[PDB]
């Protein structure tokens, strides 16, 4: 159709501009990595529990990496900036959000009504509005339409492992979202049908298979330590039958790169 | 926000109301749009969320301007560029005269230009009517209120159905399609066009089976052939009567053959086959286009 060359071209364009700060951790005094995970993981869950859309989950993640970047936070105010930011994207990207009374019932009740409307108002305030950023999802559903025939077990295959990229900051805020949707869907194919990153796909991203390695070989190791992980939920969303069961699939022992 | 001094209400447009205010130190004349945010509610309206994030990154000519958000706890504005009245007032002005065809033609590549503009860059109106599509005293036509718009994704997801006003809503949401893209734009548009000509609404129904009717008695109730796979729509009814096409010189009399070439291409019933912002901003009933003063 008419707009996807245009649309990409603005996607890699945003993408840079709606980043994080790469190293945003190192200067918070109170957070760290393996919290932010835990905090992933659970918007995961509350993601299943509410039936939200992937690509909520992804602008979220997004918006809390944004704020962080700026923003010092208390432990005890982290799960606070997880809300507000699932809350906006919610509004952002849902038919039906859920109301703001849910969000505080998930919480069990750790804040108040007022403390999520306050965070949601510092949030967009320290995003100076600027909540429709691209996403790994949204690379990942452009790259789909460059496999013949369309593979939904590939498709849900390249969403998992895109959806793990976002529970570690360390490696993957490093990576564009083009780059780790490329390296998804790579490694899915692989997987599934022993394809490569195809011709055309090098084509459209100007991504060589080598230009990709880097954050292929950290997302090889991310699915081959996937059982092992302390954070599970994205695992267990993955099993059920809509996604083909594919989080019970084996790795691909080795890549050949 | 004590900068301001409000001049008039010029309306309530949609979920806020509008007002014209003057900046007090620059002079500048603004529309404001205020937002309340009631108390312990919802927070701040999913439609301003959007309006607002949208409109930060739509900045082209015939786009309405944000200019400032003004962001308190009790309530919410959002500043933006003034222009002198919308389409629709300036239509029933031109009841009896008629808008002249370079204008018509001057608005209508105008909006196809906005429009493409928010294609391109992932964006839906979804709600192109004639009184969110501003003018000012210089022959200049914007896109407004971006409310019920959405970013959307390459491929589409089903979005919410109820959308676009009654008049200006594409068969395909009125079939209840699972996916509507960029098309229900374009659609709108062509009402809108059909309407600066005749003067008046193209399909002005009263409700959804009204809207279609009015639709299937102009352009034909559509087929396999025409639309493969409307038979299998939602609210599709083997029942629906079968009436022929007519002819767009009694559609749309005061039209020349490049006009009615837009048009029909415009009020296509495939989505997929249905003429796209850029390609129209291509056609040549453009060829001849200027930049005329509207007549009040
Ligand atoms: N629905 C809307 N959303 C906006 O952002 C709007 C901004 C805006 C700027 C100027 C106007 C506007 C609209 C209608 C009109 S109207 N109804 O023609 O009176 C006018 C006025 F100048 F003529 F008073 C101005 O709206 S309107």
Redesign the interface.
């Known amino acids: ?4 060359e ?3 071209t ?2 890699r364009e ?1 993408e840079v501009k709606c980043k994080p700060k790469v190293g945003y951790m190192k200067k918070q005094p109170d957070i760290t990595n393996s919290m932010r995970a835990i905090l992933v993981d659970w918007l995961v869950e509350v993601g299943e529990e509410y039936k939200l ?1 992937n ?1 909520t989950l992804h602008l979220a993640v997004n918006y809390i990496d944004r704020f962080l970047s700026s923003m010092s936070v208390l432990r005890g105010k982290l799960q606070l900036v997880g809300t507000a930011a699932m ?2 994207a919610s ?2 990207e849902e ?1 039906y ?1 859920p ?2 009374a849910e969000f505080v019932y998930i919480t069990d009740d750790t804040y108040t ?2 403390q ?3 965070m ?2 510092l949030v ?2 320290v995003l ?5 950023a691209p996403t790994v ?2 690379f990942l ?2 790259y789909f ?1 460059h496999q013949q025939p369309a593979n939904c077990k590939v498709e849900s295959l390249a969403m998992f492992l895109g959806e793990l990229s976002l529970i570690d900051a360390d490696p993957y805020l490093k990576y564009l979202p083009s780059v780790i949707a490329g390296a998804a869907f790579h490694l899915a194919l692989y997987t599934v049908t022993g394809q490569s990153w195809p011709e055309s796909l090098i084509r459209k991203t100007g991504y060589t298979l080598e230009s990709l390695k880097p954050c292929l070989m950290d997302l090889h190791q991310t699915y081959l330590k996937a059982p092992q992980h302390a954070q599970q939920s994205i695992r267990e969303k993955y099993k059920n039958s809509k996604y083909h069961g594919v989080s019970l699939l084996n790795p691909p022992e080795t890549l050949n790169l | 926000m004590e900068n301001f001094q409000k001049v008039e209400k010029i309306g309530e447009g949609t979920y806020g109301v509008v007002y014209k205010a003057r900046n007090k130190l620059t002079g500048e004349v603004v529309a404001l749009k205020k937002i309340r945010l009631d108390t ?1 509610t ?3 309206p ?1 439609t301003a ?2 309006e ?3 409109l ?2 739509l900045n082209h000519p015939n786009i309405v301007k944000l200019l400032d ?1 003004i ?1 308190t ?1 009790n309530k919410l504005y959002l500043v933006f560029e003034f222009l002198h009245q919308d389409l629709k007032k300036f239509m029933d002005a031109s009841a009896l005269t008629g808008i002249p065809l370079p204008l018509i033609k001057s608005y209508l590549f105008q909006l196809l230009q906005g429009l493409a503009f928010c ?4 964006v839906l109106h979804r709600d192109l009517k004639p009184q969110n599509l501003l003018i000012n005293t210089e022959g200049a036509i914007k896109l407004a209120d971006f409310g019920l718009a959405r ?1 959307f ?3 589409v ?4 159905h109820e959308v676009v006003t009654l008049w200006y809503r594409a068969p395909e949401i009125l079939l209840g399609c699972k996916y509507y ?2 098309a229900v734009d374009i659609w709108s548009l062509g009402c809108i066009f059909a309407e600066m000509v005749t003067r008046r609404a193209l399909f002005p129904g009263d409700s959804e089976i009204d809207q279609l009717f009015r639709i299937f008695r102009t352009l034909g109730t559509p087929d396999e052939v025409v639309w493969p796979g409307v038979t299998s729509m939602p609210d599709y009814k083997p029942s629906f009567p079968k009436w022929a096409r007519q002819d767009f010189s009694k559609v749309v009399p005061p039209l020349d053959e490049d006009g009615r070439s837009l048009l029909s291409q415009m009020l296509h019933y495939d989505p ?1 086959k249905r003429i ?1 912002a ?2 129209a901003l291509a056609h040549p009933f453009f060829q001849d286009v200027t930049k005329p003063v509207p007549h009040l």
Do not use: C, W
């Open positions: 159709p008419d707009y996807h245009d649309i990409h603005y996607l945003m859309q690509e809350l906006l509004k952002f038919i959000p109301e703001v009504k007022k999520v409307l306050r949601e108002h967009l305030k100076t509005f600027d909540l429709a999802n949204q559903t452009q339409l | 312990e919802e927070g701040v999913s969320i959007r607002i994030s949208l930060k990154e958000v962001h706890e294609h391109s860059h992932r970013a994704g390459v491929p997801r089903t979005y919410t893209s960029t997929n796209s850029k390609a």
